[PDB]
Amino acid sequence: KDAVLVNSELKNIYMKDVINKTNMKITKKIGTQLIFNKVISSNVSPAQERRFKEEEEVDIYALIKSYSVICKEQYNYVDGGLIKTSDREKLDSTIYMNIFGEQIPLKEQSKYKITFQNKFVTFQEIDVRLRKSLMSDNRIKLYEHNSICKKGYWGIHYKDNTTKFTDLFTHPNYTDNETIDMSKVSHFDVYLNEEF
Numbered sequence: 001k002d003a004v005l006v007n008s009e010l011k012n013i014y015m016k017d018v019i020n021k022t023n024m025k026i027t028k029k030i031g032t033q034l035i036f037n038k039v040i041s042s043n044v045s046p047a048q049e050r051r052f053k054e055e056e057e058v059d060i061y062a063l064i065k066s067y068s069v070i071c072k073e074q075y076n077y078v079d080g081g082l083i084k085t086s087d088r089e090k091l092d093s094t095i096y097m098n099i100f101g102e103q104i105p106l107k108e109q110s111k112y113k114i115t116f117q118n119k120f121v122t123f124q125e126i127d128v129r130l131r132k133s134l135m136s137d138n139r140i141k142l143y144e145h146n147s148i149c150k151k152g153y154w155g156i157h158y159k160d161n162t163t164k165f166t167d168l169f170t171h172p173n174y175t176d177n178e179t180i181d182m183s184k185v186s187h188f189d190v191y192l193n194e195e196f
């Protein structure tokens with residue numbers, strides 16, 4: 001299973017900004033990195049690299065891992081976050097986030113919703129936005145030294161009753177560009193202080 005990390009590291013990882021752009025043509029392509037023109041480098045799996053060709057337009061939603069200036073031009077490094085611009089069908093979805101946990105009032109239980117406008121969204125996007133929403137929540141303060149959440153996980157609860165669970169104290173491997181079909185998603189479930 002993915003190794004559990006501490007608040008300090010998790011906070012550092014998920015507090016960073018994200019790249020959220022559309023119609024980005026892959027300019028250069030080197031190794032396992034798909035480059036775009038500030039320069040955006042997306043580290044992806046050997047498998048995913050094959051599926052993407054240069055000059056191909058890609059929509060990007062990825063958390064930035066680091067920056068580096070090179071010859072007065074800034075580089076933004078990220079893992080995956082790619083969906084072909086031609087793979088984008090529109091769809092308005094307002095998915096509810098149900099938060100469960102001993103200190104969670106019914107009032108905060110289902111007040112959170114995450115809005116999507118494409119039928120297909122990367123899992124990285126859902127995971128990152130869900131974590132950031134939990135991080136800013138005044139009651140929860142996810143990854144803060146002082147947070148009431150010591151451990152936990154969440155899940156995408158599909159309409160067919162199946163679920164996809166993720167440990168909130170781990171850093172998923174986003175290099176595979178896993179994508180979620182939003183039309184098959186019913187809601188999101190957050191399980192605070194519950195063993196994964």
Ligand SMILES: [Zn+2]
Pocket residue numbers: 157187188189
């Ligand atoms: Zn559920």
